[PDB]
């Protein structure tokens, strides 16, 4: 069976660009605050570098007909070819559009592509067209077919700028091939169950303490350490963690026991990892490798692994439950078990040990969208203001 | 058809040529200038191992760009659709505006033709037009400017006039000499003017209302247009177009604007040749419209009152026209046209007006003469 693209489904617009005669896979992305201009952040090197899919994720709210849109501007749906669609960016809540204001380098004719708040306007809407010759106007939309989108406002395709030294997305009359990958489907999602891309808090064995980094002393070296604290640290943004999966497509699917995933601290933008001294250390995005940054949730502490099982394409079983279920974190490479140091604001340290202890049970708690978005905004603001201060100091 | 053509050309864009192609294009004006330079260059223009002998590459490039601009301007939607507010027409016009910058059009209009000149032996050396810049190329740009961008603001109207149109009118006036009148330059430039420029100013005549601070430019425009009208080689349609444009502009012009033109008309009309019909009618319309300005001592509040120098000019006009009509042999056309002019001037002139013994002495035949006009 071929799944049909479904309204209110999360999907990343994903295109390939060839460099050194080598193919690079890219998802269209944008940052909500400060930079409405869109950019391409790469997913090919998932191993060495974690791709930030939180910004590439897009939501297909409405898929109306072109002439339906015509008289609408004058005054759960199944997507079809040749039908105008409106995309809402998952993180920012804004809508992808052509800006009509262009940097105009090389091509004075083309416009730029970016986010805008307002729903009204022909700029937000984009017309679907079948890139493949087999598909035709009015045909069912495939789950994973190559696709080309044309801006309603200026009839310019969502185009990739090869000529620029850095790959740029812009509205142009030169076509560009885009592939749609279903990140997640909202309707089939089950409440209270862990799903990919969710921001969660790792509560330890006492019910109350949560895994966290030290409070900001303006020192990143101090922040890099990882430990358990109980109290207001839970309600603060420091305790928040994001579970990002290795899979680029269907990353928003339900999480499975023993499924390799990466843990990212949203406030610091750093990925949990295992060092050679067996101690957890947050690293930078570029330096965080898959072997260093990868963990699994296991219900049972038994040494024997679940086994090799292939990735399915769908939401899957509601296998991990928030609060009720108990999950043990185990490093995929070494097999070590995340355990409490048990010795001397509790400020009790977290270390990776192969035997572990009995009180390694950890319960997951969902974080509200407001809290997650606020933490992301805090990280972006800290980065930008630190850049400003460094520039002023220079 | 316009929508289909513009969609296809904008879909597949290399039809526009290298300048408008969109990869480091030097631009439309820069392409015009570079093609002019190529046309001047002998090696680049020809094969170097007329049209059959050598297709001039510069003229070919310029003709291609002019044809493209003309096609786009004709593909531009009509004004009535925009006034109705049709989104499709608005989008097409916006697309064409994005395609063609305004500054490039203004610069191409600013480009000036090469000039026929009298040689030492006395003959006229006429530049080969099939190998050079021609007024039809600028006519295409004027058509695009009118249909796509439009002329709705007095500032842009005056700036466009001063930069591009007035030099061409002065060039036509210069060619109005008897020796150079039969040259291909005079005929082609007159065709371009009377076909594109003068009708555009006629349609944009109401914009000439508030030009108090630009008085010199409009006076120069009136003088150039009147000299072109006095030009001999003009056809009936060209003469009619020039007459309509001049009447339309002088109708909206402020009464104190036209004083040098009034002096010129005062000198020219009493001869009462066939050329005097349009000046006579223009005087009739001006005096009929501005009779309030002259006769009433208060005059128009916004437009002031007469300085009495124009009053002396008007009285001399009235007496000269009366004497010339009295001694002139009767024919219905000139008499019927002259009667309203005499009546209007008599009505405009205050009956109590005291002709000053001390008028501005030594009226100068320098700016004013029949022999070369200067």
From Swiss-Prot, chain A:
<comment type="subunit">
    <text>Homotetramer. Can also form heterotetramers with RYR1 and RYR3. Interacts with FKBP1A and FKBP1B; these interactions may stabilize the channel in its closed state and prevent Ca(2+) leaks. Interacts with CALM and S100A1; these interactions regulate channel activity. Identified in a complex composed of RYR2, FKBP1B, PKA catalytic subunit, PRKAR2A, AKAP6, and the protein phosphatases PP2A and PP1. Interacts directly with FKBP1B, PKA, PP1 and PP2A. Interacts with SELENON. In cardiac muscles, identified in a complex, composed of FSD2, CMYA5 and RYR2.</text>
</comment>
<comment type="similarity">
    <text>Belongs to the ryanodine receptor (TC 1.A.3.1) family. RYR2 subfamily.</text>
</comment>
<protein>
    <recommendedName>
        <fullName>Ryanodine receptor 2</fullName>
    </recommendedName>
</protein>
<comment type="function">
    <text>Cytosolic calcium-activated calcium channel that mediates the release of Ca(2+) from the sarcoplasmic reticulum into the cytosol and thereby plays a key role in triggering cardiac muscle contraction. Aberrant channel activation can lead to cardiac arrhythmia. In cardiac myocytes, calcium release is triggered by increased Ca(2+) cytosolic levels due to activation of the L-type calcium channel CACNA1C. The calcium channel activity is modulated by formation of heterotetramers with RYR3. Required for cellular calcium ion homeostasis. Required for embryonic heart development.</text>
</comment>
<feature type="domain" description="MIR 5">
    <location>
        <begin position="317"/>
        <end position="367"/>
    </location>
</feature>
<feature type="domain" description="MIR 2">
    <location>
        <begin position="138"/>
        <end position="183"/>
    </location>
</feature>
<feature type="domain" description="MIR 1">
    <location>
        <begin position="76"/>
        <end position="131"/>
    </location>
</feature>
<feature type="domain" description="MIR 4">
    <location>
        <begin position="252"/>
        <end position="309"/>
    </location>
</feature>
<feature type="domain" description="MIR 3">
    <location>
        <begin position="191"/>
        <end position="246"/>
    </location>
</feature>
């Amino acid at each position: 069976e071929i799944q049909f693209l479904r309204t209110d489904d999360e999907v990343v617009l994903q295109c390939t660009a060839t460099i050194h005669k080598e193919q690079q896979k890219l998802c269209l992305a944008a940052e909500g605050f400060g930079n409405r201009l869109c950019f391409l952040e790469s997913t090919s090197n998932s191993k060495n570098v974690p791709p930030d899919l939180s910004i590439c994720t897009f939501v297909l709210e409405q898929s109306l007909s072109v002439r339906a849109l015509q008289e609408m501007l004058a005054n759960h749906r199944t997507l079809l070819y040749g039908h105008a669609i409106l995309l809402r960016h998952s993180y920012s809540g804004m809508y992808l559009c052509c800006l009509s204001t262009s940097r105009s380098s090389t091509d004075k004719l083309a416009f730029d592509v970016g986010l805008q708040e307002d729903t009204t306007g022909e700029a937000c809407w984009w017309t679907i067209h079948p890139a493949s010759k087999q598909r035709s106007e009015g045909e069912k939309v495939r789950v994973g077919d190559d696709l080309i989108l044309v801006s309603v406002s200026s009839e310019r395709y969502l185009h990739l700028s090869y000529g620029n030294g850095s790959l740029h997305v812009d509205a142009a009359f030169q076509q560009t091939l885009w592939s749609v990958a279903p990140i997640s489907s909202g309707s089939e999602a089950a409440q209270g169950y862990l799903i990919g891309g969710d921001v969660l808090r790792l509560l330890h064995g006492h019910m109350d303490e949560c895994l966290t980094v030290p409070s900001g002393e303006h020192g990143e070296e101090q922040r890099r350490t990882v430990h358990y604290e109980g109290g207001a640290v839970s309600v603060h943004a420091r305790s928040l963690w994001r579970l990002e999966t290795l899979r680029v497509a269907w990353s928003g699917s339900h999480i499975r026991w023993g499924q390799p995933f990466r843990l990212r601290h949203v406030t610091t933008g750093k990925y949990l990892s295992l060092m050679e001294d067996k101690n957890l250390l947050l690293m930078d995005k570029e330096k965080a490798d898959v072997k260093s940054t990868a963990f699994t949730f296991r219900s049972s502490k038994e040494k024997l692994d679940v086994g090799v099982r292939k990735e399915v394409d769908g939401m899957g079983t509601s296998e991990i439950k928030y609060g009720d279920s108990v999950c043990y974190i185990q490093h995929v490479d070494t097999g070590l078990w995340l355990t409490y140091q048990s010795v001397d604001s509790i400020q009790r340290k977290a270390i990776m040990h192969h035997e572990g202890h009995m009180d390694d049970g950890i319960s997951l708690s969902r974080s509200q969208h407001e809290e997650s978005r606020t933490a992301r905004v805090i990280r972006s603001t800290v980065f930008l203001f630190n850049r400003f201060i460094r520039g002023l100091d220079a | 058809n316009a929508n289909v053509v513009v969609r296809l050309l904008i879909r597949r864009p290399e039809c526009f040529g290298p300048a408008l192609r969109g990869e480091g294009g030097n631009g439309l004006l820069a392409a015009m200038e570079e093609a002019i330079k190529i046309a001047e260059d002998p090696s680049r223009d020809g094969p170097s191992p007329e049209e059959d002998d050598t297709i001039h590459m510069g003229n070919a490039i310029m003709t291609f760009y002019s044809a493209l601009i003309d096609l786009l301007g004709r593909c531009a939607p009509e004004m009535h659709l925009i006034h109705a507010g049709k989104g499709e027409a608005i989008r097409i016009r916006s697309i064409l505006r994005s395609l063609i910058p305004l500054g490039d059009l203004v610069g191409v209009i600013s480009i000036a033709f090469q000039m026929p000149t009298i040689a030492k032996d006395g003959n006229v050396v006429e530049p080969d037009m099939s190998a050079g810049f021609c007024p039809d190329h600028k006519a295409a740009m004027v058509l695009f400017l009118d249909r796509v961008y439009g002329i709705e603001v007095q500032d842009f109207l005056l700036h466009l006039l001063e930069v591009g149109f007035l030099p061409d009118l002065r060039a036509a006036a210069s060619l109005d000499t008897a020796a150079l009148s039969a040259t291909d330059m005079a005929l082609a430039l007159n065709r371009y003017l009377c076909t594109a420029v003068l009708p555009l100013l006629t349609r944009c005549a109401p914009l000439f209302a508030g030009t108090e601070h630009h008085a010199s430019l409009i006076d120069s425009l009136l003088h150039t247009v009147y000299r072109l009208s006095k030009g001999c080689s003009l056809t009936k349609a060209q003469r009619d177009s020039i007459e309509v444009c001049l009447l339309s502009i002088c109708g909206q012009l402020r009464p104190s604007m036209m004083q040098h033109l009034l002096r010129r008309l005062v000198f020219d009309v009493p001869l009462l040749n066939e050329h005097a019909k349009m000046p006579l009618k223009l005087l009739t319309n001006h005096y009929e419209r501005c009779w309030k300005y002259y006769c009433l001592p208060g005059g128009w509040g916004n437009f002031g009152a007469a300085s009495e120098e124009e009053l002396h000019l008007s009285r001399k006009l009235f007496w000269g026209i009366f004497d010339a009509l009295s001694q002139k042999k009767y024919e219905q056309e000139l008499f019927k046209l002259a009667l309203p002019c005499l009546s209007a001037v008599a009505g405009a002139l205050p009956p109590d007006y005291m002709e000053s013994n001390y008028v501005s002495m030594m009226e100068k035949q320098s700016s004013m003469d029949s022999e070369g006009n200067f």
